[model samples]
Target: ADVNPLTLGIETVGGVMTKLIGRNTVIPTKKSQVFSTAADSQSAVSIVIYEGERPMVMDNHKLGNFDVTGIPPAPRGVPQIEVTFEIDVNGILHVSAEDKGTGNKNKLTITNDHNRLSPEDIERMINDADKFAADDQAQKEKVESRNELE
Candidate 1:
C-alpha cells in the first residue's frame, strides 16, 4: 500500500523536529503525545507543526501553528498538554492541543490546497536530510545535553 512520503513532526524545545508520525506511515493515521510548558506560570503554548525528515524544525516545512490558551498557571513541566496529529486519506493534516488541567484546546488544519510541497521541494529536503544526518544528530545531542544541565 502507498504511504505518507514525508514525516509529520512537531516543533519541540530548542527548535528540534520531534517526529510524531514517521515517513511512510499509512494513511488515515493518528498519533498523540504529551508536552509540557517550558516556564513557570505559562498560560499558553504555541503548537508548531512541520513536515519533513530533518531533525531541526528550521530545516523542515512549517505546516501550521495554533496556541492552546487558558492553561492553569503552574510550574514548569507541571501541566500536561496532549497534542494529537491526524492525517486523513486525502493527505489533509489535523492538529490539536489540549491542556489536560483545564481542557483548554486549540487546533489547526493543513489542507492540500495550500502549503502543499512540490516534487522539487521534497527532493531537496530529502537530499538535505541525508547530507546533514550526522550533523543534525550531533547538534540535537548537544542541545539535549545543554538543556538537561540547565
Candidate 2:
C-alpha cells in the first residue's frame, strides 16, 4: 500500500513516546540526499546523510526512501535543502522540509539503524557495519604510519 509520504510529517504525538522519538532531528550515515536541478532535464544531486535511533539518531537503522529535489533554476552551488526530520513510534521518520532560497518542498528517505530494514537485512547491516569500521580503521592506521615514516 502506498501512503502519503507527507502524512508522517503531519501529526506528531508527544509524551513518554516523545522522549523515545523526537521531531526535527537528523543524523549522518552512508546514505545520500539527491535532487534534480532541472525538471526532466539532465542531472541529479546527492548527499550522504542519515537519521534515526532512540536518542542518538545515527544509531537507528535504514528507513523508507531518500533524495532531495525541486531545485529551482539556479547554479548548482546555490541549490540546497534545509531538511527537518521527525521520528515516530514505529521508528519511522517524518521529515517536513523546505529549501532555503527556492522554498521547494522535498521528501527524503532516512536510513534508521532502528527501523530502516527487515530483521534479515539488519543482520547483514550489522555484519557490514563491523566490517566497514575495521576497514576504515585499517586505512586510517595506514595513513598515519605513512605520515610517521615521512
Candidate 3:
C-alpha cells in the first residue's frame, strides 16, 4: 500500500531498457517485444531483463538474463528475437525469448531473485495502486493545471 507496482523491460544495446509493461498498468498482465541480433554471425541473443523506470537498463536492477542459443547463422537483423513477459497475479514474472529463424527458445521465472516480492506482498501493495487510481487521475489533472499556469 505504500509503493508503486513494478515494471518489466528488456535491455537493448547501449544500456537502454525498452519497456514492455508500464508501472501500475494492471496485474496479471503480459507483453512482448521483438528485437534482433546485432551482428551478422551472431548465434545468440541475450534476454536481459530489468525492472524500473530508468532509461538505462544498467541503472535499473537486472532481474535475470539468459540466451536463446543456437540460432541459425544469419545476417545481422535477420534473426528475429521475440521476447515475452508475463507477470501473474502473484507478481512473479515469466520471461521467454525465441529466435524465429532457428526456432530456438528459452525462458525463465523470476520469483525469489531480483527484488521480487511474495504473492501476498504483491497483493497487499497493489491494493493501494487500485485504491489510488481514481485519486491519481485527480492529481494528474492538478499537475497539468499547474503546468498551464504561466
Candidate 4:
C-alpha cells in the first residue's frame, strides 16, 4: 500500500525552499532546525513555510507563516531561532518558533480551511494514494491534475 508523501520546508531570502522534513516522513513526526537573523539590529524573524517538491518557495504552495517577535536586537546571525514542525495524529501541522536569546515564542496550527488540508482531506488523499498504487504514472498525473484544479 502506497502512502501519500508528507513534506515540510522553510523559505530563504531568495525564496529558496529549504526542506526540513521531506516526503516519506512518517506521520506523528517531529523535526527541528536552527536559523538566525540575516541582519544586524534585527528585531523579528519571519518564517515563511511551504509544502512541495520545488526548487523555489514561490513554485510551491505556501502552507503558512509566523514571526518570532519581541527579540532583543542583535548583530547579524547572532540570535538563534529554533523552528520545529510537528504533525499530530490528526494530520494537523503544528509549527512553532522560538528566539533562544529573548525567549520569545510563536506557534501556529494548520488545520483550517485556508491553505492547509483538513483532517478528512488528508485521510482521503492517503487512501487514494493506495487506490492509485497500481498505476504510478496515472497516479502522478491524477494528483497533479487535482492540484491544478485545487
Candidate 5:
C-alpha cells in the first residue's frame, strides 16, 4: 500500500508541530483536531500548515497558511476551532479550519504539482530528521520553556 512519507502537522501555541496525520498513513485519509485561541477575545486564528518529521514547525516544510476569521470573542481557550486535513488518492491535500461558535471558515488546497518536492528533497529531509533529531528536540524544549515564562 502507498503511504504518505512525511508527517502532516499544524503550528501550535509554542510553534511546535502538532501532528494531525502521521507518516506512513494510507492514502485517501481524513483527520481533524480541535484548537483554541491563546489570548482573550481573539477573533482570528492563523492556520499554518507544514509537513515533515521534525518536532518543531520551523524545521518542517511550510505548505501554506490561511486565516479563519470572525471568531466570537471569549476568554482564552474558550472558543472551539476545528481543523481538518484530508488527502486524496491523487495526493491532493485539503485543509480547513472552522470557528465552531460562528461557523466562519477558511480552506487551502494543495496539489502535488504545486510546491513540487523532488525525490532528493524528500530523502534529504527524512535523513535530516534522523541526523538532527536530538538537536531539534532540544531546540523545541527551549522554545517551550521560553513560551512558558512569557
Candidate 6:
C-alpha cells in the first residue's frame, strides 16, 4: 500500500491510543507523540505505556514500552515531552521521548528479536536499494553497450 504522511491521533474502537504522528501504517513504521506529566512531584514517574489504536494493550497486541524518570517534577502541564518511535522491518519497535522544554531525551527500545538492526538501521538499507535499481538508465546502457545494441 502507498504511504500517506499526516499527523494522526488515532483513537481506535478497540480503545488504543498512541498520541502519535502516524505514517506508512504497517510494520517498520514510525510514530511520535507529545505528552505531559499529570501532576507535580520531585520524584520519578512511570507510565506502562503501550502502542496501538485499541483501548487496552491486552486486547491488542502491544509493541512495548519503558519509563521516563528523574522528571524533577514540574507543575501539572508544565513539561512538554515529545516522543519518536520506529518499527524495524524485523517487526521490532524503538521509542525515544524528549522533553521539549529542556531538550532532554529518554530513549527506550524494545523488540521481539535481539540481534537484528533497528529501523534507524533500515534507513541505510533503503538508501542502498537506489544503487541496485533495475531501471537504472546508466546500468541499462552499460548492459546494452550502446543504444544501437537495443
* TM-score against truth, every candidate: 0.91, 0.40, 0.71, 0.72, 0.88, 0.50
lDDT of 1 by residue, 1-150 (tens): 667788997887788778889998888899998888877888888888898987778888998888988878788788888889998888778998888888889898988897588989888888887799899778776764211000
Q: Which candidate model has the greater TM-score, 1 or 4?
A: 1
Give residue 101's error in model 6 in angstroms: 3.0
Candidate 1 positional error at 55, Å: 1.6
Candidate 6 is scored at a TM of 0.50
Q: Write out the backbone clash pairs for model 3.
A: none
Residues 61-140 of candidate 2: C-alpha lDDT, one tens digit per residue: 32343444555556433444444554444544555445565665656545345444455654564455456776544643
Cand. 3 Cα-lDDT: 0.68
Candidate 3 TM-score, C-alpha based? 0.71
List RMSD in Å for every model shown.
2.9, 13.6, 10.0, 9.0, 3.1, 18.3
Worst 10 residues of 1 by lDDT: 141-150
Candidate with more favorable, higher lDDT: 1 or 2: 1
- Give the lowest summed-lDDT range of ten residues in model 4: 141-150
lDDT of each: 0.81, 0.35, 0.68, 0.68, 0.82, 0.47
- lDDT string for model 6 (43-136, tens) is 3333343432222234222434455555666775566666666666765556776667666666666655654445554455344435455534
RMSD of 2: 13.6
Please tell me which model should have the higher lDDT, number 1 or number 4: 1
lDDT of 5 by residue, 40-77 (tens): 88888888989998887877899999998887778777
Q: Give the poorly placed runs of model 4, Cα more than 4 Å off.
A: 1-6, 116-150
Write down the worst ten-residue block by lDDT for model 3. Answer: 141-150
